[PDB]
Amino acid sequence: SWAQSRDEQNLLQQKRIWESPLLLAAKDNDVQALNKLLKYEDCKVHQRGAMGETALHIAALYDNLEAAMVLMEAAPELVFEPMTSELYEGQTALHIAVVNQNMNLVRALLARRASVSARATGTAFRRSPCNLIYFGEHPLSFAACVNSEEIVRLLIEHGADIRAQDSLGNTVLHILILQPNKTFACQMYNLLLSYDRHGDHLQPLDLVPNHQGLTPFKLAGVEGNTVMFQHLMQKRKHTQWTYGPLTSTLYDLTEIDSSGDEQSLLELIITTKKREARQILDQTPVKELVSLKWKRYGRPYFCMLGAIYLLYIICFTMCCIYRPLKPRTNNRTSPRDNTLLQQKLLQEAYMTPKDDIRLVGELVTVIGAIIILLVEVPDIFRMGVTRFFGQTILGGPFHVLIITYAFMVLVTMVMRLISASGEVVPMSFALVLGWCNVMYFARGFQMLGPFTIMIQKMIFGDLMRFCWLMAVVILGFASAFYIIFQTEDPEELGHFYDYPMALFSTFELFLTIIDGPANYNVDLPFMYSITYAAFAIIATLLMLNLLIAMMGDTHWRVAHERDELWRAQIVATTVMLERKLPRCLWPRSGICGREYGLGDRWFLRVEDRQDL
Amino acid sequence: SWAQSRDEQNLLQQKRIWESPLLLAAKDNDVQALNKLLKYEDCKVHQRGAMGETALHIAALYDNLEAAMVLMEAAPELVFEPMTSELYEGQTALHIAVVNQNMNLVRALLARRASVSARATGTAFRRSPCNLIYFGEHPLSFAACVNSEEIVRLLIEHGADIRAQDSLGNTVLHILILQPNKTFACQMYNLLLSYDRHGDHLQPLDLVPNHQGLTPFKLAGVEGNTVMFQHLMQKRKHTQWTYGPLTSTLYDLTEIDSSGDEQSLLELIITTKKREARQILDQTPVKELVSLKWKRYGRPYFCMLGAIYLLYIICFTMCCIYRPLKPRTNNRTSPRDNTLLQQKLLQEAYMTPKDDIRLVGELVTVIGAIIILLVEVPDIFRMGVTRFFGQTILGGPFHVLIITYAFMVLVTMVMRLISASGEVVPMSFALVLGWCNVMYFARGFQMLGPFTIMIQKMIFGDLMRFCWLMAVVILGFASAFYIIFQTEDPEELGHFYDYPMALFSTFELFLTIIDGPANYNVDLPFMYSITYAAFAIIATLLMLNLLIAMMGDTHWRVAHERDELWRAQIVATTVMLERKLPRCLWPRSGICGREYGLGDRWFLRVEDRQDL
Ligand SMILES: O=c1ccc(CN2CCN([C@H]3CC[C@@](O)(c4cccc(C(F)(F)F)c4)CC3)CC2)c[nH]1
Ligand SMILES: O=c1ccc(CN2CCN([C@H]3CC[C@@](O)(c4cccc(C(F)(F)F)c4)CC3)CC2)c[nH]1
Ligand SMILES: O=c1ccc(CN2CCN([C@H]3CC[C@@](O)(c4cccc(C(F)(F)F)c4)CC3)CC2)c[nH]1
Ligand SMILES: [Ca+2]
Asked: Spans of the ANK repeats (chains A, B)?
């Protein structure tokens, strides 16, 4: 958060140029002074600017062709001297004129034995939202981003190497994927692949990995580059037989499927959270693969885990409602009419000839709680500890919720074995978080799927937009009613005797789920009737109806994210089950190879009407 | 509200022209009669019209070129005689033909030694919504508004002065800012500045103030002239270094910032209430200045005042709920079962070894109530007494609400020191208006900011559209139920015994926050069951559901004013805090001068991708 140090360096650049006389003469076409300043005075050859540059840079930066040519004749050594500051490090004079994208200077600058393999690092060239650009490092890539393809044929002639990575790791092909000018950068991608004379007996320049470990085809998948993803597909598929308006292709599918030992394409589209990245699930190779792996091979394995889970909690609620109880002995009721306990649960009463079935009842549900923690907790020691806060948009808060369920059921084993007294406090949390976690199996069924991803967008966002302003009005008005019934016997209107209940009975009246305090035999204090009518004119006629105004306004301008988030949620179920189920189940989708003269990669086909 | 006197004068103008024969001959091209009427008769040279005009005016008003030329030859003195009425005062014959915007008369009228410095005052030329025009006063400005630029080069040749103000104070440059024809009046603004040969060793004709104290650049800011605000910015900025698609400018910022001793641009955009004026907060110099002064330097100073205020009311509610009480002695209960008081608060009981902490409790909250009135009440003796009713749309009703809070807490000091009896009546107002005034700190946080400016648009407007028709149905039906339970013992159905409660129990049933009167052991009067079912068919199924129909219809057609009013509300917090905080805090945003050869004004920079 110190961009002011970057803002200081730019404004220091002018004042240094205003100081020296020939840098002003390099800023403009003051070529009359360039004949004088080098012939008459001395030693003004190697002084630097504010960010450590030469007069050759400044004439290159403000595209002054006439002044740059005289300075090269004066001392043909300034091309070898790069910039030296920490923002612009190593950036030579060739790099400046190529970004200006229309120069005949590069034919005159490379004529004086200029270098093409200069290392242009620095902090204004690495990928970050602080910069507005990402040009890579090499001048081959500098021409590749501004789309001056006349320069590229002239720069590749003098020894420019294609396969050149950088300090971040990506190649020249990867820079073309990451541009906002998507439309006619695709026409340049045909050129950079075409200047590949030999494959160097290794990977043929389209499969090179970076340090972050991606191919250029996969990198189109993560950043959501839709239009470039189509032209990359054109090398993979090949048509088989055309028959009038009916045609039939055969997609390659060696890289868009999870068959492997490491990352795939369907793994990374779910893992990223870019809004544009989840539109590749609508194009023709990916949609056919995910729907063939879900109408079969995925859905009866999803409802087999459906019915096993529903027969877990029903064998748990039946274990819950039969708690071992007795009458309340040896603790006879000391306060009068203010305690109403009469059970005081058992501790050593699993020796009874009915209770042997309930011993099975805990033994079933506590074996499953071991299996829950041994199927999710080993996914945050192999994976990072922030991925539970990382997949939270798509399929995330249920993985928080199932961990907390099994941690509560293990508490009630600890307390009952040690014979504790307070017992229903975790066991009531272990029965809401059970039955509200069968909510997770609503993403499978359509007509129940855009109604779970809607309420996830609503319990965050809009209701947290309201629960503050709900807990600001009621937190005050409860303190207004608790003053006003200090002068009142709680035998009538017992809604306010303790401030811990007055804060409750205001919240329970704010939603109109109590009637409202009225006795009608005795009178009321006079200030009550005014400040309660000011509550109703806020609570039931302004503040609560403004939910339905916001529920009805949100629910149609996320009605297109709704039906798309369900499609991305069906894939996070698809990739997760294939990774955890073994290999006898889930045969790999598609027809295999090494039988029909194709190779070892396994294919898929799709056919469609051309529509003429 | 007497436009009929203005309507009378226009219709009197025709009948006077119908009377005299040569004014009809001036109304048309009756030039045959003009050869006769001046040669044959006498003395018809100086008679006036209804609004005091000559025959030269009438031939100029209906653009009759032939009749105007003969009348100038007859007596070359009529050009010096202006109009003389109270509507059209001093308006000479040159002024009429210039408004018609296409005349060669002005070359023939200025040929006879016409004056250019005529003072055209009057009540139809000053800026008001009664007029439909605002032309200024000088004929240089008359040509400047109708955009006849061929006249302007011909009128400036004969001695027209540019720097000429009027009775309101504004200049010729200011008239071009206030036109509805915004698009190609900008192309005329280049001409009027270009005829400035010398700067007169003073301000160079672009910084002149009026009597209301504005520059032409600021006057574009107040009236919301968006397209003219762009071309005015073009003289202030100057580019620094262009680098491919990345460019980097340096805005001037000596006039769009509150650094001074008086008004600035950001002061006046909030103060005006013009709907178009709050769109200048989206253009590139103003948005970058307000967001840099809010991500830093403004937001932790806004939440430092956040947490200090929340630890004020919690140290006040804790002071509230511990009121000094006792049992109700010496006033034993005289009415039976109709009074239920048993406390009767203390008056001289701050001498007790627990109560010394609560003496700190009042002493904290009553020092702050002095500080509230000594930080807001001196903003309506220096400023006007109508600005609390003047900033009410943007950041206004909270400044009403914080004054009323501190005035109520000072009441409960007066009553407790004088040992009064009625005590909870202002102290309950001092606890709703406390906790509902921490609502004011919801404009700072996004996702809580379009939900406070929404409810301000709703407690006014739509709920005052409904609270009348709510208090017309219930005011009658309560009088219908209070008749019908005159014949009823209040021991059962005690919802109606006094008309002050029947008016309450109808309002509390109109929102369905009581059940509804039913006993079901004894019967009811028969007319009750009909006229109460006619209440429910209005109160819960027609009249109250029509809120949600209006809440759901308002909340999407102010959904663009919603997210814009929040941006203007963040600026009224920004300008206000910088004006009241001292100078060691809030350093002025941007890089300073007198170090880099620029001057003494302090600059800002911004850079953006050109997008080619
Ligand atoms: O004392 C209590 C009683 C009940 C609780 C229950 N929690 C835990 C779970 N959440 C509820 C709310 C709605 C629920 O469908 C849900 C949770 C998370 C995500 C979703 C989603 F919308 F994504 F499906 C739904 C379950 C129970 C919130 C309160 C806590 N503490
Ligand atoms: O090109 C266009 C674009 C937009 C349009 C008009 N919209 C905008 C309004 N929409 C909906 C918005 C919400 C709406 O259900 C609703 C109104 C009031 C109350 C509710 C409820 F209370 F039920 F939530 C819903 C009406 C129209 C329909 C299309 C026409 N033509
Ligand atoms: O006896 C009583 C008891 C309580 C009251 C409360 N008033 C005073 C303050 N306003 C309420 C309504 C909603 C509230 O957020 C608000 C007020 C003003 C402006 C806004 C805004 F929308 F601008 F934030 C909100 C505060 C309490 C109206 C009624 C009056 N009289
Ligand atoms: Ca109800």
From this structure: 17-47, 51-80, 89-118, 135-164, 168-210, 212-241
Is A42 labeled as ligand-binding? no
DSSP string of A257-299? Answer: S--SSS--HHHHHHH---TTGGGGGGSHHHHHHHHHHHHSSSS
User: How many angstroms separate the CA of residue A120 from the nearest CA in chain B?
Assistant: 16
Helices A467-484 and B424-435: crossing angle, nearest 10°? 170
> For residue A475, which of A513, A511, A510 has the smallest C-alpha distance?
A510
Nearest residue on chain B to A534, judged by CA atoms?
B432
Restricting to B residues 334-373, those with a Cβ less than 8 Å away from any Cβ of A are 337-343
Pick the residue whose CA is nearest to atom 29 on ligand 3. Answer: A534
Tokens representing B127 are 């800026």
User: What residue type is assigned to position A513 of the chain?
Assistant: I
The residue with tokens 């032409």 is: B216
Q: Hey, what are B414's tokens?
A: 């007066």
Joined tokens for residue A78: 């300034």
Please state, as a whole number, how many other Cβ atoms lie within 10 Å of the Cβ of residue A470. 17
Measure the CA–CA gap between A119 and A525, rounded to whole angstroms: 84
Give, in order, the Cα–Cα distances in Å from B171 to each of A1, A478, B195, B459, B540.
45, 61, 15, 44, 62
Query: Could you give the residue ranges of the DSSP H alpha helices within B224-336?
Result: 226-233, 265-271, 284-295, 300-320
φ, ψ at B122 (rounded to 5°): 135, 170
Write the burial class of residue A369 (CB in 10 Å: 0-12 exposed, 13-18 middle, 19+ buried): buried
- Nearest-atom index, ligand 1, CA of A432: 4
Q: What is the dihedral of CA B354, B358, B363, B368, to 10 degrees?
A: 160
Distances (CA, A) of B80 to A106, B107, B159: 72, 16, 17
Query: Contact B431/A480, CB-based, under 8 Å?
Result: yes
Mutate to test the pocket of ligand 1, among A432, A438, A566 (most ligand atoms within 8 A of CB): A432
Nearest Cα residue to A473 out of B395, B426, B406, B442: B442
**φ/ψ (deg, to 5) at B119:** -95, 105
CATH number, residue A14: 1.25.40.20
CA proximity to A62, closest of A103, A110, A111, A121: A103
The backbone torsions φ and ψ at residue B389, rounded to the nearest 5 degrees and listed phi first, read -90, 20
Range of the domain at A21: 3-234
Tokens 């129940």 correspond to what residue? A448
Residues whose CB falls within 8 Å of the CB of residue B424, separated by 6 or more in sequence, listed in order: A483, A484, A487, A527
Q: How many CB atoms lie within 10 A of CB A183?
A: 9
Candidates A14, A100, A469; nearest CB to B451: A469
Distance set, CA B591 to CA B63, B238, B240, B599 (Å) = 59, 16, 15, 12
Beta-bridge partners for B242: B247
Q: Does B246 touch chain A (CB under 8 A)?
A: yes
Give residue A159's identity as a one-letter amino acid code: G
Instruction: Provide the experimental method for this PDB entry.
Output: cryo-EM
Given resolution (angstroms): 3.7
